[PDB]
């Protein structure tokens, strides 16, 4: 069932990328993907956005029992996503799940949008 843990970590990555970029476009592309090409392109582009936030020190890992979290600073707003970001192995195992069923991209997109919406509402 680690499949759900992998999907949850991918959803956290998408939610961090959405909150930092203030753009739903990558989550929309991920949730509407019909091929491994579209999913893999979004996985790169969202990690490239997260990499810029890391280099600017606007995205950082933290703890908030203590739970792992990711702090995101965007346009003077502060957000905190609870959970881990995916590992390289999670991306590889998720891409294998997508090669079997692109449904998992829709599931991760739905979770990512739920995380982002709850944080934006708060």
């Amino acid at each position: 069932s680690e499949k759900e843990n992998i999907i949850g970590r991918i959803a956290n990555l998408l939610a961090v990328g959405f909150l930092y970029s203030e753009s739903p476009t990558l989550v929309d592309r991920f949730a509407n993907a019909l091929s491994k090409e579209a999913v893999t392109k979004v996985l790169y582009d969202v990690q490239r956005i997260v990499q810029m936030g890391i280099d600017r020190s606007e995205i950082a890992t933290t703890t908030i029992k203590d739970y792992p979290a990711v702090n995101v600073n965007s346009s003077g707003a502060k957000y905190t996503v609870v959970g881990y970001l995916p590992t390289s192995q999670d991306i590889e195992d998720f891409l294998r799940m997508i090669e079997e069923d692109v449904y998992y991209a829709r599931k991760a997109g739905a979770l990512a949008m739920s995380i982002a919406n709850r944080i934006k509402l708060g």
Binding site: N32, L34, S35, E99, E100, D101
Partner: protein, 316 residues
């Protein structure tokens, strides 16, 4: 009868859309299962339905028939192929409804004389005494060939914007490029022949006189389908089609060629044509092949160069 299998190559195309979601227009896709050494893979591949082709064929037949003076219905002169289905449709044209079952044939003939499209295309009338007529042309779905271990088809989304001086303007369209193959059947022998048992009703002599012209028009209407005048979104997304392989068989008995999903599908259909003529006691069997991708053909086939020669030979 006439049977045909045709292979197409289309690039940067969007002809058959589907239900729009949000601000996006989506293409029509179907699932396929591909065999690999590791196992099986499920892939979504674009397709084109068999209703747009029928609509294009009927429109072309209307255009050709109105030039030669053949009768055309009022609602069919306008590109609205409702046909003589309900009472409201019959009211405009001016045809009395069938009385009972025994009179049904008569009604058919009357309809068969007031609209050519209702004859070749076929019609259905719902009511107390329904009448039926199966279409004389049969078309199938356009699906790209599943040949080898790779599917030569893609599907991407394109982003478009409209410019305004007072912003207060964004849409997306799906485009594809595949290698399509499709097959069709036509029975020119049954044209202008009623399809209901009974006794002959006055007015069949006109149908006998018009049989030749109707057959010629029906054969001529295939040129539009074989030339690529189907689908929609041609104003701004006009595609680029091309012909690769074509096999057409003319016989006097039921027969169909092999699907164009393999690289060698002409030799098989020629051998099967010979074998079927051997068993069904046929007399006429002719095959015309157009080859552009350099695949193996066989022996005993006339080789053409264009589609116009095919239509001329079919009419002859």
């Amino acid at each position: 009868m006439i049977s045909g299998s045709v292979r197409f190559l289309v690039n940067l195309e969007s002809l058959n859309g589907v239900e729009s979601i949000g601000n996006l227009t989506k293409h029509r896709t179907a699932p396929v299962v591909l065999k690999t050494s590791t196992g099986y893979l499920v892939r979504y591949v674009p397709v084109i339905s068999g209703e747009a082709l029928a609509h294009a064929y009927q429109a072309s037949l209307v255009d050709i028939a109105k030039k030669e003076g053949l009768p055309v219905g009022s609602l069919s002169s306008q590109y609205e192929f409702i046909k003589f289905s309900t009472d409201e449709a019959l009211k405009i044209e001016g045809i009395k409804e069938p009385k009972d079952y025994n009179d049904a044939r008569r009604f058919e003939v009357e309809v068969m004389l007031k609209d050519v499209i209702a004859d070749v295309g076929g019609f259905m009338y719902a009511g107390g005494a329904p009448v039926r007529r199966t279409s004389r042309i049969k078309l199938g779905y356009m699906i790209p060939a599943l040949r080898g271990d790779e599917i030569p088809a893609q599907l991407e989304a394109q982003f478009h914007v409209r410019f305004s001086n007072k912003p207060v303007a964004i849409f997306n369209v799906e485009v594809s490029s595949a290698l399509y193959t499709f097959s069709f059947e036509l029975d020119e022998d049954l044209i202008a022949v009623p399809s209901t048992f009974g006794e002959k009703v006055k007015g069949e002599e006109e149908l006998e006189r018009q049989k030749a012209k109707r057959v010629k028009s029906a054969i001529k209407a295939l040129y539009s389908l074989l030339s690529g005048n189907f689908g929609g979104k041609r104003s701004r997304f006009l595609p680029s089609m091309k012909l690769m392989s074509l096999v057409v068989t003319k016989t006097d008995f039921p027969f169909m060629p092999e699907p164009a999903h393999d690289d060698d599908y002409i030799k098989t259909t020629i051998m099967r044509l010979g074998k079927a003529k051997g068993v069904l006691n046929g007399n006429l069997a002719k095959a015309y092949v157009i080859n552009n991708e350099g695949i193996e053909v066989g022996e005993g086939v006339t080789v053409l160069s264009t589609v116009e020669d095919l239509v001329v030979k079919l009419e002859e």
